């Protein structure tokens, strides 16, 4: 992949994978995503255990599933994992919603 462009619409479901992790989650992994304008950046984990209608949920295989990505959910998805070999796997996927910003406040 490496910087993959993914288009989506407000209220549309979207799923992303974290390059590096196999079918099942081996060791601990840290995911980070930047959305909004600057104060929306949040850290994704292998266990969201939270409301999907508000944000999204994390798959057991180490993936990410969203029920409906809103215009505010727009941003960039970045994942980082580490294998037993010592090397780490990087994953960057840019996501764009329907409506876009122009003059925020």
């Amino acid at each position: 992949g490496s910087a993959q462009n993914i288009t989506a619409r407000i209220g549309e479901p979207l799923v992303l994978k974290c390059k590096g992790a196999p079918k099942k989650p081996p060791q601990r992994l840290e995911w980070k995503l930047n959305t909004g304008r600057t104060e929306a950046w949040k850290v994704l984990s292998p266990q969201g255990g939270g409301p999907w209608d508000s944000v999204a949920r994390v798959l057991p295989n180490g993936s990410l599933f969203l029920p409906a990505v809103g215009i505010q959910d727009e941003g960039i998805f970045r994942c980082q994992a580490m294998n037993r070999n010592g090397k780490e796997t990087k994953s960057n996927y840019r996501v764009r919603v329907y409506q876009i910003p122009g003059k925020p406040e």
Binding site: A3, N5, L33, N34, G75, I76, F77, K90, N92, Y93
Partner: peptide, 7 residues
């Protein structure tokens, strides 16, 4: 500017 990604 926008994470790793950049166009």
């Amino acid at each position: 500017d926008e994470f790793k990604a950049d166009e």
